[PDB]
Design an enzyme around this catalytic site. Structure first.
Site, PDB file in Angstrom:
ATOM      1  CG  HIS A  40      -2.081   3.281   4.423  1.00  0.00           C
ATOM      2  ND1 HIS A  40      -3.004   2.721   5.282  1.00  0.00           N
ATOM      3  CD2 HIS A  40      -1.445   2.241   3.830  1.00  0.00           C
ATOM      4  CE1 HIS A  40      -2.934   1.404   5.206  1.00  0.00           C
ATOM      5  NE2 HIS A  40      -1.995   1.085   4.332  1.00  0.00           N
ATOM      6  N   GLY A  99      -2.031  -4.150   0.430  1.00  0.00           N
ATOM      7  CA  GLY A  99      -2.253  -5.361   1.204  1.00  0.00           C
ATOM      8  C   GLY A  99      -1.262  -6.499   1.022  1.00  0.00           C
ATOM      9  CG  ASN A 136       0.448  -5.274   4.365  1.00  0.00           C
ATOM     10  OD1 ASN A 136       0.723  -4.851   3.243  1.00  0.00           O
ATOM     11  ND2 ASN A 136      -0.308  -4.596   5.220  1.00  0.00           N
ATOM     12  CB  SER A 138      -0.938   0.015   1.211  1.00  0.00           C
ATOM     13  OG  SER A 138      -1.892  -1.031   1.121  1.00  0.00           O
ATOM     14  CG  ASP A 145      -4.896   4.337   7.769  1.00  0.00           C
ATOM     15  OD1 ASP A 145      -3.956   5.155   7.830  1.00  0.00           O
ATOM     16  OD2 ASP A 145      -5.171   3.695   6.733  1.00  0.00           O
TER      17      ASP A 145
END
EC number: 3.1.2.2
Length: 178
Positions: free
Chosen positions: A156, A43, A72, A10, A153
């Site tokens: 990112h 992801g 991840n 990402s 979040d």
């Protein structure tokens, strides 16, 4: 022009934004001299990136490959040792394809646990030394210092951050790609 392949998650693909808004596209725009191919997918774990690597190396025949993966893995049930071996394999594959791997340090959240964080973080300096390759600092460290560049979040970078990451990356990569 030679090709720089970006194999990331990402952070390089762009979270909830189009490909053209992500920093690799901006870098490609900023650079006729060097082609920047973004092979990042939101992801992706290091294993998922490794799974896509063979076809990418054959199709793009890159001179350099920026590896930005591992973040991840924790949430996906992978132990630091598994992440290490996967990245080791990626570096091996990249070198065997006569390309130069450029590894980037990755830092997981603090709420992951000291036991994990210490082991995870150690992976990168170890491999960089093991394969004698460049180890770029985690580009998000500078981004975290600007809340206005972070998405909700707290993980990112947002759209506004992309141009700056592109400039930061251009600076870090300049010496490595001549």
């Amino acid at each position: 022009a030679d090709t720089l392949l970006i194999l990331g998650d990402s952070l390089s693909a762009g979270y909830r934004m189009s490909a053209s808004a992500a920093w690799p596209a901006l870098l490609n725009d900023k650079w006729s001299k060097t082609s920047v191919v973004n092979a990042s997918i939101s992801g992706d774990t290091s294993q998922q990136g490794l799974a896509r690597l063979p076809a990418l190396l054959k199709q793009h025949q890159p001179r350099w490959v920026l590896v930005e993966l591992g973040g991840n893995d924790g949430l996906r049930g992978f132990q630091p040792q598994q992440t290490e071996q996967t990245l080791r394999q990626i570096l091996q594959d990249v070198k065997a394809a006569n390309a130069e791997p450029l590894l980037m340090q990755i830092r997981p959240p603090a709420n992951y646990g000291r036991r994990y964080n210490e082991a995870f973080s150690a992976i990168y300096p170890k491999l960089a030394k093991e394969f004698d390759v460049p180890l770029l600092p985690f580009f998000m460290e500078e981004v975290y210092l600007k809340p206005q560049w972070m998405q909700d979040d707290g993980i990112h970078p947002n759209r506004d951050a992309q141009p700056f990451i592109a400039d930061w990356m251009a600076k870090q990569l300049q010496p490595l790609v001549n």
